[PDB]
Amino acid sequence: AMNTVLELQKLAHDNMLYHRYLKPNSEYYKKIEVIYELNDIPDTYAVFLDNESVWKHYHVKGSTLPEQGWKIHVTSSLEDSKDVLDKVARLCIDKKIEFKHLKDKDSFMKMNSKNANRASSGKFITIYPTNNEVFVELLEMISLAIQDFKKGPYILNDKRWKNSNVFYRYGGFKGIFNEHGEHCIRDKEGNLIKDQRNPFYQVPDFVKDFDDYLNTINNSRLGKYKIETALSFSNAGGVYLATRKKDNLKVIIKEARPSAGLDGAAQDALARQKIEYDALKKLKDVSGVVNLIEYFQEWEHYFLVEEFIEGRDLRQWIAQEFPFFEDNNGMSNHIKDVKMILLQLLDLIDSMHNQGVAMGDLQPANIMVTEDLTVRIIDFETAMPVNSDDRPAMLTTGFVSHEMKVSGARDWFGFKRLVRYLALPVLTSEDLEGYLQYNHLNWIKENYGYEFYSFIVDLQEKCDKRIKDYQTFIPKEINLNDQTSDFNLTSIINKLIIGVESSLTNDERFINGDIRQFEMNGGKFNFLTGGSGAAFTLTKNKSSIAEVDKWIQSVLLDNLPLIEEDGLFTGKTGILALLYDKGYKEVVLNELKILKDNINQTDISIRSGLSGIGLFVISLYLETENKEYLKLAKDLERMIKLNRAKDKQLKVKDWMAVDIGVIDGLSGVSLFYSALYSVTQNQKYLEEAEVLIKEDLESTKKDDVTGVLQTVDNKNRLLPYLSGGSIGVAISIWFLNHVSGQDLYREEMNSILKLSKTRCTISGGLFDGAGSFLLIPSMVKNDKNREVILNEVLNLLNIFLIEKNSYYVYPGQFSYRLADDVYTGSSGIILALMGVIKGNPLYWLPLVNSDEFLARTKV
Ligand SMILES: Nc1ncnc2c1ncn2[C@@H]1O[C@H](COP(=O)(O)OP(=O)(O)OP(=O)(O)O)[C@@H](O)[C@H]1O
Numbered sequence: 001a002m003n004t005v006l007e008l009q010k011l012a013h014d015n016m017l018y019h020r021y022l023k024p025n026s027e028y029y030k031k032i033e034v035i036y037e038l039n040d041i042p043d044t045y046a047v048f049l050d051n052e053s054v055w056k057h058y059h060v061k062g063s064t065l066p067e068q069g070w071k072i073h074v075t076s077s078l079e080d081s082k083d084v085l086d087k088v089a090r091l092c093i094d095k096k097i098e099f100k101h102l103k104d105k106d107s108f109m110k111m112n113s114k115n116a117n118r119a120s121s122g123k124f125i126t127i128y129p130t131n132n133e134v135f136v137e138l139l140e141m142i143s144l145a146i147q148d149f150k151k152g153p154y155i156l157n158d159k160r161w162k163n164s165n166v167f168y169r170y171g172g173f174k175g176i177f178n179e180h181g182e183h184c185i186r187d188k189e190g191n192l193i194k195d196q197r198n199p200f201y202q203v204p205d206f207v208k209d210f211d212d213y214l215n216t217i218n219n220s221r222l223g224k225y226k227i228e229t230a231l232s233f234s235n236a237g238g239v240y241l242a243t244r245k246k247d248n249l250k251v252i253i254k255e256a257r258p259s260a261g262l263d264g265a266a267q268d269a270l271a272r273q274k275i276e277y278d279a280l281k282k283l284k285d286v287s288g289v290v291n292l293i294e295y296f297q298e299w300e301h302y303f304l305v306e307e308f309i310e311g312r313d314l315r316q317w318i319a320q321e322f323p324f325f326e327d328n329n330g331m332s333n334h335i336k337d338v339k340m341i342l343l344q345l346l347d348l349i350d351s352m353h354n355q356g357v358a359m360g361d362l363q364p365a366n367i368m369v370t371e372d373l374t375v376r377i378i379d380f381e382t383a384m385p386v387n388s389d390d391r392p393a394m395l396t397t398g399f400v401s402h403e404m405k406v407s408g409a410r411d412w413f414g415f416k417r418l419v420r421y422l423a424l425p426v427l428t429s430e431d432l433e434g435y436l437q438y439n440h441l442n443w444i445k446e447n448y449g450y451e452f453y454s455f456i457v458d459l460q461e462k463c464d465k466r467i468k469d470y471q472t473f474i475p476k477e478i479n480l481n482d483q484t485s486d487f488n489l490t491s492i493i494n495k496l497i498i499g500v501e502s503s504l505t506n507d508e509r510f511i512n513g514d515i516r517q518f519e520m521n522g523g524k525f526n527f528l529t530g531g532s533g534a535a536f537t538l539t540k541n542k543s544s545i546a547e548v549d550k551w552i553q554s555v556l557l558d559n560l561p562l563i564e565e566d567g568l569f570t571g572k573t574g575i576l577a578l579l580y581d582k583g584y585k586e587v588v589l590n591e592l593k594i595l596k597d598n599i600n601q602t603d604i605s606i607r608s609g610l611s612g613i614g615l616f617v618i619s620l621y622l623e624t625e626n627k628e629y630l631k632l633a634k635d636l637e638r639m640i641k642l643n644r645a646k647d648k649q650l651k652v653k654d655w656m657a658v659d660i661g662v663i664d665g666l667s668g669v670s671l672f673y674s675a676l677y678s679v680t681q682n683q684k685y686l687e688e689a690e691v692l693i694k695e696d697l698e699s700t701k702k703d704d705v706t707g708v709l710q711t712v713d714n715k716n717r718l719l720p721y722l723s724g725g726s727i728g729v730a731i732s733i734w735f736l737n738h739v740s741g742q743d744l745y746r747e748e749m750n751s752i753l754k755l756s757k758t759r760c761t762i763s764g765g766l767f768d769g770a771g772s773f774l775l776i777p778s779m780v781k782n783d784k785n786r787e788v789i790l791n792e793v794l795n796l797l798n799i800f801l802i803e804k805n806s807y808y809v810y811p812g813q814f815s816y817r818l819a820d821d822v823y824t825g826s827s828g829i830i831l832a833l834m835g836v837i838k839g840n841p842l843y844w845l846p847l848v849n850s851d852e853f854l855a856r857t858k859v
């Protein structure tokens with residue numbers, strides 16, 4: 001009965017962090033800041049919280065507990081949290097039992113949110129019995145204490161004790177780590193077994209018999225369908241593709257787990273599902289709205305069965321159908337398809353509102369298009385009555401405004417933004433829309449022509465009219481002539497520099513940057529997102545010397561020894577390049593002595609691994625003719641060799657890293673080999689360089705219509721970008737050729753350069769967006785061909801480049817906020833543009849005396 005429901009969680013299947021950084025009324029990424037106090041705590045307990053984590057520990061006396069064993073987890077609903085911890089803790093205290101709980105409301109929310117890990121979900125209190133006897137004792141006593149409480153979210157990783165909120169599992173009591181994996185437990189033999197935390201209960205081999213014991217005293221409306229696959233999982237439940245048996249109707253089954261998957265409004269899976277069901281009933285006769293089949297409870301979960309709509313959501317449609325490639329004259333078909341979709345969508349929103357319901361999240365993900373471009377809307381979990389001025393549970397940044405107050409108005413605003421989006425699929429937030437509205441409309445007009453432009457403006461104006469019926473709303477003026485593109489590279493560099501100069505933080509970060517300034521180690525100080533990137537870039541432009549010197553002297557130097565990673569982009573080495581150029585020779589020489597020691601190990605990437613470090617080391621060897629640095633480079637090479645022999649498969653730490661290309665993949669490793677060749681003349685390093693590129697080229701795909709080569713990842717995604725994409729591959733080919741005097745991979749090179757024909761990218765940044773394309777002209781030696789390529793990518797840059805006062809600034813990832821870092825902001829754009837001037841496709845690398853590096857590594 002219940003085993004069938006739970007098994008659903010086992011089936012196979014096929015950036016949200018930005019929200020936490022939209023502190024209102026800032027133009028930058030800035031954290032939004034947000035309590036289980038218990039009293040009468042005996043002195044036999046020590047009470048502390050985690051370094052950076054969710055748990056408040058209650059450690060008893062001076063006892064030692066086993067390093068693994070049978071542990072108890074307790075679950076509670078949010079409204080019952082304080083009341084459940086009171087009864088549970090004051091039991092454990094009064095029995096001298098070690099336990100922990102989630103430290104505050106925020107933590108509870110984070111761990112039980114819609115997108116929280118399914119394994120970790122529901123675990124509010126963790127209890128650590130000293131041995132198996134007190135374990136089984138506690139099962140009964142805790143459950144006796146909490147019986148008169150509402151059932152909380154089921155913990156998918158545990159077995160439940162009877163019909164209580166008491167759950168149990170065997171795993172690590174402490175965190176026991178290894179060299180290739182996470183949390184582990186000990187065996188009876190080769191004690192290296194991995195602690196399994198999955199969305200289903202599992203038992204370590206060597207304690208099965210005790211689980212067998214535990215099972216002793218431990219006390220179909222859905223069988224109508226063949227549940228084929230799971231389209232998606234969240235903490236709130238699964239969404240499954242099914243076929244109704246003896247009928248063969250494809251349906252969508254949407255699962256809600258009671259008390260699980262909270263949102264910002266503290267609404268659970270069931271609360272949202274009911275809203276979706278109510279909405280779909282009210283819209284039974286609106287043919288554009290997906291139709292509900294049936295609604296039933298099976299075991300404890302609730303199941304909303306739904307028409308399966310054949311086609312693609314507008315995100316997929318955009319990705320696959322938008323005419324990204326400039327093939328010379330031919331965007332008229334797009335114009336046709338966009339009009340047909342949008343005019344359908346206008347009528348659909350009117351129909352929904354006529355029935356008194358706003359859909360609540362009008363944005364590409366929820367709009368589907370059939371093969372003949374019929375428009376349907378799915379996902380009514382966000383539905384509200386039109387006219388309601390309730391705070392929405394969720395906002396899709398990119399298609400919302402805080403200026404919207406009424407639910408009906410929110411739909412029209414999203415549509416309004418959707419209208420321009422299909423014409424230029426480039427994300428923006430309300431915070432930068434003030435600026436980028438000009439960039440986008442100007443682009444649409446120059447590229448589609450006045451007719452289509454006026455279709456867009458008119459339709460957006462009708463949206464305005466629609467909003468005005470719901471609330472007071474009066475949008476700003478137009479006048480597109482106020483915004484002009486720039487095609488003068490020096491001008492763009494100089495104005496972006498003034499931009500940076502005008503946005504210095506007087507804090508430890510030096511500049512505003514990507515959220516990774518906050519989310520990652522060294523992020524405030526390193527080259528990638530930290531102040532070293534900007535300070536380096538400003539130094540190259542002889543700008544802000546006094547400000548740079550002060551940040552170095554008073555922040556960077558005291559932080560340098562304490563940055564634990566040596567990574568080129570993420571850690572010490574990138575910083576040391578800045579330091580050397582700035583004259584701090586003594587400081588650099590000292591850090592180099594430590595460098596052979598600490599963490600010369602498994603990561604080989606340019607970003608954070610041995611290649612990047614080695615590449616820095618080689619650059620330092622070229623600058624100082626100190627042979628110890630060549631020796632060290634050689635040592636790093638052998639260690640890369642060792643790593644490759646242990647296993648070819650690369651590990652990614654960053655959620656946007658892909659194990660191909662120059663940043664995180666083998667193409668990057670080849671840069672180091674190429675450079676090592678330049679300084680040794682050892683042919684063998686040249687061979688390795690070439691072999692590494694070859695291996696990456698195996699993960700590329702040529703389009704048949706367009707001639708463009710891109711990389712293809714492990715989810716069949718095509719990539720152009722410097723990070724993960726073919727432009728980075730091209731750069732390594734270029735450098736291979738630069739150091740050897742050859743012209744290898746001419747064919748691949750030529751088909752990568754064709755990326756300069758790209759009309760738009762969803763984001764603007766050097767690594768993951770438009771800025772990547774600025775690297776293309778820097779790899780073209782012929783002046784005449786360069787000029788055409790440069791103009792094309794400058795058209796692309798001008799979609800992102802913001803005029804603010806009389807200087808330029810640059811949007812960060814997804815253009816939600818501004819950034820001035822190398823990774824996403826103006827610093828990386830500057831370095832790439834300076835690269836174009838200098839014919840240098842490596843100029844974005846923090847190498848020692850980089851203005852000399854090409855000349856010094858030339859064949
Ligand atoms: N009625 C339907 N017909 C066809 N596909 C559907 C239907 N309802 C949902 N889907 C698709 O099933 C998948 C999972 O739906 P779910 O609501 O869980 O979205 P999700 O995983 O959060 O994805 P997204 O990031 O697109 O919101 C999505 O690709 C969604 O578009």
Ligand SMILES: [Ca+2]
Nearest residue numbers: 365366378379
């Ligand atoms: Ca959805």
